[PDB]
Subunit: 474 residues, 4 copies
């Protein structure tokens, strides 16, 4: 029952009230985080804006040095941090440690990507002859204070994915972790503090949404909002963003389109790995199979045999399927399962629920009148929807309010490229499950899946602006 | 004389049951009417745009560029016909109005050629992890969808085209909402795109009263991107309605001209007057406060005053430097700022006179920070001179403004000027020249309340495009 | 038979002596071109260097305007120029006109690509903290005088592909067209002259290689040599270039690799179109089929049927197969045919020669001991070489001293991509004949196929340098 | 004194004959390096070409890992290597250590710059509507075997500046250091070997030029020559290169243009620092002052005083002026000094020679008739040339056959930029001495000063080619 503290202007601060964090899989009390007041948020932001001047005027090399050091510390403490991250969000122990290792890779990569970013020289004479001696020297500058809001399912990886790109460009950062995941976010903060990040350059905020939820976003000191979480929450942030740029990484309902010529065993392997990873609690994940009917029976059988083998149990045992993050999540997933059952879908694997541990449910013969065809479960349930034409698969895919990623399984890549052109998604994976990585690749979602382009170099670009200095050569 | 104008809706020209009569601000002459669209008519515009998006985005870049080049050619052909009406509609000098149309064609042509040669990128998985060395990402550009372009009264053609052409070349469809005062000129611009053969629904116009369709056009879920130029308050209101849609805002400015002791004062005065009083000060990018070191302030003020006294004041048809302001409220607001400065003891170096809404160019010296004129954007022909004692003080006063569009530094020490520029909270700093949006290939952006996003041709195209990534494993 | 003149310092000038040019297909006298002396080359280069200062200091907009005007004039006169080009190099009349139209497209594209090129601003602080106030303003500049040497087979297209990229970047140009093709190159020059190109900015040189061949390249006024022609001639230029940058577009022996799963009809169509276009007188042309044995018989039969449909005749009649450029070329092609026949190759179509008009010869069972497996014929003969494995196809392909392009015909795209990585060529076309276009794409050759990267933006880059201005911010 | 060996295919090889190396300032015997035969050169290139396939197929991150490890080893052993490097080339001890530290900086920077290099995707529809479905996937590839030839004055820095950018891109490398500097080059090689570089990926060649000088360059196994050295030697390489790409970093005669409004004390400080560094044995170095008449007298006085403060002594004592590299070098510098004296130049500082240790000689009233106005001394002698106009300064500067860098001293930066545009050099430094750094900035010379563009990212680009894969989307 350790009492965790926020990093504020280089110091660690409790608050008068606290929030106790329990492990979703066991109920174990993991500790508490501060329930900051609005005035304490004011001090976090005041500290950040004060530190911005000296931070942005450091060299890229100096800023990159802090990031690399913090990544080295994360690697050192990956087992320690991952062990707690596992408990806090009911993520498998090994996956939790992997998340911290991956966070280190992102931080190091962002440091080296950002430090060699360049400006441009534009010629007046490109546009008008009379300005041929007028040139613009266009250099990059930070946007200022970035509010990073990490999600429960990747409370270290999708905190670092915002912090490091922000910091290399000369921004200051305040991290608001989710309450479930606040310990892991504060453990990440410990690595940055030990790396010697200058006071105020990076700070953390924890507290109850009823007290500081909107206040942290509406605060005029914030110049940029970088958020990962649910679609409805992301929509609420867009309403509070005003003129300030935002990045939103929200939900998905990624389709896996399986054509008649697909390698059905490989498609099943990727589909199951992608759909049921972390019990389906991922934005990027196969969430519906759109399969040509000629291969639907064989594919359903190949998916069923794998889903039946998934382990269902506790995070400490590295179970494939772990308890969902809270009771509301499991209730919602059970409801989608019940709707599909009641509307006549075929349950190829049996629904079971012990507490919030839902066994993985595979439905065949899902029709688009069923909620499970569209709504994001964030739970271990996968529908198979049979189609008769590629055109019908494209229409059903694009009919979703979500547009994060898609997978296309086929041996005809020229056709798959033509399909990918028509899919309203950010990324199409050919003969592979959907995935955010590799983290240098762009990561973006269309429609209700978010706004902005992430991936390392793209997140740095998003959190930098330009300063043009124009003069006339004589 | 006065004509009834129509909106371009899905390849057809449509009247509405009601209309809005547009009058010339300088003379009161009736110029014509534009439709007062209803929300149902806006729905039909957006429905047609979304239906045209599929065929438009699948055309080749070269095909889309051809339409844009043809539209620009027609604008050039009709620059005198369009400029003459634009001049009357927003009280812009006749020659300056024709020049606006010509510049619009330049932007359209440049956008077509910039956008058609944009490229994708191939990323190596092995750049990040060895196990992904055979995985590559093919990243190609795609449009965002339907762009709502909202142009401003002061550049109803130029800052319409600066949105329409970058959006169109990338494969977006567009609906233009001109300002009511400027709607005729916006519809004349649309005529050129229609005659160029732009496919039905790829480009449409919307005109109407704010009280009827103002919020409706922005909140409509068919709109995927909002691109707005206008006042700061109206811009902030659009931000509240954007939701998750990306937006670009080009809002107000209070550009400072910092004059150091080693500056060429005569050249500084020339650039400061050209930039401060162009179009009677009705420009976001324009010198709106001089921050001058006290040692050179007396001589600089005398140089500026001499030039301001030479500015012509009169009617648009006479190509006066100072023309009547856009409306009475604008001139009333400017008169109030002048009075506050006078009553607080500023020195009127040139006299305040008002004929209708034609305010003579007023130069104030010894302006202090308690005066509204030190901070508020007049959008009128009034320039304060603020004396400073250190460059640090000039930097602090400049940055205290809630605006951060552009700034000018007048000095012979460019290394120092570059260091100053780094500290100024603005988009662009011009050295030994007035602030300005051009050349239109250069970035144009404002910090703080001056807006959001980066324009200039290539930057506008980048803003109104997204990416589509296709990832596969080499075998 | 007009007496053509060179464009020299804005003026059209004859020389003391001339060279009469005849149509290879008919012997018709087309006119004469000047036989410039070395002293006259000196005057051309002097005028060009004199014009360079005023030319490079113009705005990009102003230089682009001249190029667009010259392209419009080419479009206006495409029929007149193409009619003469057709006779001069025995190219089909319609193909000749198309070459002129393509040249206008390349010029217009070069003008708009070049005018919006930019520089870069590099930060000292990316490399060392102590240099964080030091920035480098890096702008592009012309290399100076570009010598452009066009080839007989594309004497307008592959002149303009050098002139326009050079000119937009602010270089001055001297065009040395080949004697056979000098009339067409001068006809191109007329368009640039009528467009108003300033005196000396663009000039032409014509003459006998024994008199000015090496002299035009060794001359110290030349800052860049941009040459298209035979490999041996290009190797000779590499020696004479010294330290000066060069681009060489030389020979090719492009392989068309046909795998067992290929679309054989598609492969046969593309192979025949590519191998026999302009009677095989193209560097980028399928010049050997490497086909898996299992599909060789059927592929050969389908190629044979298409070859037998090619028209054999005169340029004026738009014949597919026209007479070769000269007698030496036909003699050399006949020698390769005889060597293949003598060594046991199967003649699927029969050799026939009337003057220099050789009928298209398709050989099957070509082996690596035959000259036709390796030497570039520049004539209408195609060898089919049977392989047992894809590994063998890659080896045989890469054993060539040439490495311009390659074609891979197969339905397995990821495998084709892996093969492409292994091929020592500049460009690999999947399920398509090799081709240089579209002209925005890179065009380059490995090994003896040349040096430098062409395609419009690449050509501009090659013929520019950079000028770095470094200062410290204070 | 050690018997040094070449790194050949992961082994350290002796040759039958060897070359004893002596310290130029003391005559101390430092060791011997192998005198390789042409057959031993073949074995080096054979090993490299065999290692290339496995090395180019590694991921970027795997190649970068080797480079970082080699840089770490160099940092560790900087004192040990610098101590020997100081003796071998008579470089100040601390300066020799600084060279090794800078080489590690370049190696680390090259690793991270090259690992995130990207390809491009070009649209057929950018050029013609009919090809809108055709796209080109353009990816970078190594050129092959790079021959890296380092110079005596930077035998580690300007060996590493070639090795690391070549390696990260997937090339294999053979390093030929100069005989005087071979120990330092082989000491650098030890760091790459200990870092675990795969056998044959990196090798060294040492020997006498009469036996292997031309042989190493004209060998057809070599795909790229990357050379730093004298202009005459470099000229010879451009001839032996054929069509193969090269980079040449040759001599310079950098002008320092001092205008009437210049900070004369700052000008003198930078001029003396840049002109006399390493006794003037640097390509980038102020080698002639072009000063406007009205400030010449005062500038010359300030330069003279600073020249008199330079220490003149042995490398181990960190003297500013150390003995030149060999007797030939000092004989040549003495001849240039004598020519200036006999032609009436004013010797502001005294010429004294003890062995090969020449005291720093400053000349005023140097005219264009004197050899010192033009010839690169590579010794501690500096001419001051008075000019009457800025136009005369530009003309004299550009009349040099060299065009590496220039310095402009003035407070009128717009005018300085306009002057820089006219100066036929690669880089112009404003109010600073000329210098290669920072190593991320472009480094290049015009005219006889070299060919190609270095600095880190530019060297990587130079030693890469592109592979284009074109296909039609369906």
């Amino acid at each position: 029952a350790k009492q965790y503290k926020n990093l504020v202007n280089g110091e660690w601060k409790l608050s008068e009230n606290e929030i106790t964090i329990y492990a979703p899989a066991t109920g174990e009390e993991l500790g508490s985080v501060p329930a900051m007041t609005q005035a304490e948020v004011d001090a976090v932001y005041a500290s950040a804006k004060k530190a911005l001047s000296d931070w942005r005027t450091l060299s890229y090399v100096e800023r990159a040095a802090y990031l690399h050091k913090a990544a080295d510390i994360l690697v050192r403490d990956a087992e320690k941090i991952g062990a707690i991250l596992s408990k806090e969000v009911a993520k498998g122990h090994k996956a939790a440690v992997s998340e911290v290792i991956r966070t280190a890779e992102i931080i190091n990569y962002a440091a080296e990507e950002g430090l060699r970013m360049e400006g441009e020289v534009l010629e007046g004479g490109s546009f008008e002859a009379a300005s041929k001696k007028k040139i613009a020297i266009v250099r990059r500058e930070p946007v200022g204070l970035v509010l990073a809001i990490s999600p429960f399912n990747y409370p270290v990886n999708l905190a670092g994915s915002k912090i490091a790109p922000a910091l290399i460009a000369g921004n200051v950062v305040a991290l608001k972790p989710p309450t479930q995941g606040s310990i892991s976010g504060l453990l990440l903060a410990e690595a940055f503090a030990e790396a010697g990040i200058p006071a105020g350059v990076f700070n953390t905020i924890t507290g109850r949404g009823s007290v500081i939820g909107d206040y942290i976003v509406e605060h005029e000191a914030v110049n940029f909002i970088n958020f990962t979480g649910s679609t409805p929450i992301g929509e609420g942030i867009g309403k509070l963003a005003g003129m300030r740029p935002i990045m939103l990484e929200l939900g998905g309902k990624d389709s896996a389109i399986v054509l008649e010529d697909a390698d059905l065993a490989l498609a099943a392997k990727n589909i199951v790995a992608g759909a049921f990873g972390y019990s389906g609690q991922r934005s990027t994940a196969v969430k519906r199979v759109l399969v040509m009917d000629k291969v639907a029976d064989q594919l359903a059988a190949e998916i069923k045999t794998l889903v039946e083998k998934l382990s269902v149990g506790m995070p400490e045992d590295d179970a494939d399927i772990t308890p969902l993050i809270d009771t509301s999540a499991a209730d919602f997933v059970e409801g989608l399962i019940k709707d599909a059952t009641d509307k006549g879908a075929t349950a190829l694997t049996a629904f079971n629920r012990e507490g919030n541990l839902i066994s993985p449910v595979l439905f065949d013969h899902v029709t688009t009148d069923m909620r499970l065809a569209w709504e994001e479960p964030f739970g271990p349930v996968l529908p198979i929807i049979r189609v008769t034409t590629v055109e019908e698969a494209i229409k059903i895919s694009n009919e979703s309010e979500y547009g994060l990623q898609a997978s296309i399984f086929t041996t005809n890549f020229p056709k798959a490229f033509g399909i990918a052109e028509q899919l309203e998604v950010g990324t199409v994976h050919l003969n592979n499950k959907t995935q955010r990585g590799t983290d240098n690749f762009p990561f973006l979602g269309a429609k209700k899946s978010g706004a902005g382009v992430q991936g390392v170099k793209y997140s740095i670009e998003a959190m930098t602006t330009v300063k043009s200095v124009v003069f006339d050569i004589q």
